[PDB]
Amino acid sequence: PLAKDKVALLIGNMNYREHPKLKAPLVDVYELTNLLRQLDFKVVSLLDLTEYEMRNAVDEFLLLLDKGVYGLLYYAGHGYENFGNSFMVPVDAPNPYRSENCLCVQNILKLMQEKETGLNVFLLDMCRVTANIVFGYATCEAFEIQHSGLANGIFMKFLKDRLLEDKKITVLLDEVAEDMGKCHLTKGKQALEIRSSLSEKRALTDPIQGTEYSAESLVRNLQWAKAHELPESMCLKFDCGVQIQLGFAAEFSNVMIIYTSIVYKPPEIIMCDAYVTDFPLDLDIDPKDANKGTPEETGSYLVSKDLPKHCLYTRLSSLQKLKEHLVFTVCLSYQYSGLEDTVEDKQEVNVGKPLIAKL
């Protein structure tokens, strides 16, 4: 069995405006992204999407599902069930739940049934002609804290240990269901429901068609690369002599970490700090969560010890809301040894449209 292409969309909703916040989707989406990339999937990973953002991302993923393509859609977050229908709850959903503000799972499944995909795996990890659809519906908020301090969901804990196996995906999911049935938290409970219309031996490990005769995979690699460009590191020189470096890192397709570091501080300056401020209003960055001494303090625990020491960190987690160039100010507060007060100096910076903001 061959795949025309391998495309995946992973959505993790945590920071809910009107519902309890979740912790596991952060690590789960991150770890599943790296695992799927190892299996040659072009992965788009998105955190904290609103109703209109979720609908657009799912529609765009559905658009990639041409004949023979392998697709994987994973959603982790709040879910709701109402009279035979299940719904994915976006972060801007009002309380109480209502269908028009949520994404109907049955409507997605119905649109997936119309595709001629080689394999379509739709996995929900919710806090409650064949299309070859394999649907996994986990209803575990329960999670486990690792030796690292990161929260791993019950479904993903077992899934990550078996996802790289060269076995038929339905057989793989049935092993994960057995693992959860042995787990004390989910032992005698209906924690995972698998529905499958898979008539042939398809696996996530199946190779992609050769590029000599099938160039669809190359186009999608170019489009994935285009939507995943990080700004290059930049050095700003200030009038007092201080030089600041602005660094960039990616956590998810819509989550970027910005850090500032002091490259040079003249001897005359006793203490200086470079802060990033005045970001575009659509980004919704609360200044009390920016310019932290560690990446963890910003909510960034993946790509945390992989950033230089003695920097200030800022997490931009809503890049899908950016409709213009990312223009912000680098503020430098500095003190001379024998001076009365702190001196302020501001410099504007344009880093274009990073990651999915490019689209």
Q: Known catalytic residues? A: 78, 127
* Cβ closest to ligand OZQ, residue 160 vs residue 220: 220
Tell me how far, at minimum, the Cβ of 169 lies from ligand OZQ, in Å.
Answer: 18
* Cβ closest to ligand OZQ, residue 300 vs residue 320: 320
171, 202 contact by CB (below 8 A): no
Tell me how far, at minimum, the Cβ of 241 lies from ligand OZQ, in Å.
Answer: 42
Tell me how far, at minimum, the Cβ of 239 lies from ligand OZQ, in Å.
Answer: 40
Q: What is the 3-state secondary structure (H, E, C) of 181-248?
A: HHCCCCCCCCCEEEEECCCCCCCCCCCECCCCCCCHHHHHHHHHHHCCCCCCCEEEECCCCCEEEEEE
Tell me how far, at minimum, the Cβ of 46 lies from ligand OZQ, in Å.
Answer: 6
Task: Give the tokens for residue 357.
Answer: 């903001």
Tell me how far, at minimum, the Cβ of 49 lies from ligand OZQ, in Å.
Answer: 6
Task: Give the tokens for residue 62.
Answer: 């559905």
* Cβ closest to ligand OZQ, residue 235 vs residue 359: 359
Amino acid at position 298, single letter: T
* Cβ closest to ligand OZQ, residue 55 vs residue 265: 55
- Contacts with ligand OZQ, residue ranges (CB under 6 A): 7-9, 42, 44, 46, 49, 53, 56-57, 60-61, 220, 223-224, 227, 253, 320, 356, 359
243, 37 contact by CB (below 8 A): no
| Nearest to 316, CA basis, from 233, 254, 231, 238 | 254
* Cβ closest to ligand OZQ, residue 139 vs residue 253: 253
How many Å apart are CA 158 and CA 142, to the nearest integer?
A: 14
Rg of the chain, C-alpha, whole Å = 23
Tell me how far, at minimum, the Cβ of 101 lies from ligand OZQ, in Å.
Answer: 16
* Cβ closest to ligand OZQ, residue 57 vs residue 285: 57
Task: Give the tokens for residue 75.
Answer: 């959603």
* Cβ closest to ligand OZQ, residue 295 vs residue 354: 354
Displacement of CA 120 from its chain's centroid (Å): 20
Helix 51-63 vs helix 105-113: angle between axes, to the nearest 10 degrees? 10
| Nearest to 290, CA basis, from 335, 265, 262, 258 | 258
261, 272 contact by CB (below 8 A): no
Tell me how far, at minimum, the Cβ of 72 lies from ligand OZQ, in Å.
Answer: 9
**Which long-range CB contacts under 8 A does 344-351 form with residues at least 24 apart?**
345/238, 345/239, 345/240, 347/236, 347/238, 349/234, 349/236, 349/246, 350/325, 350/326, 351/231, 351/234, 351/246, 351/248, 351/325, 351/326
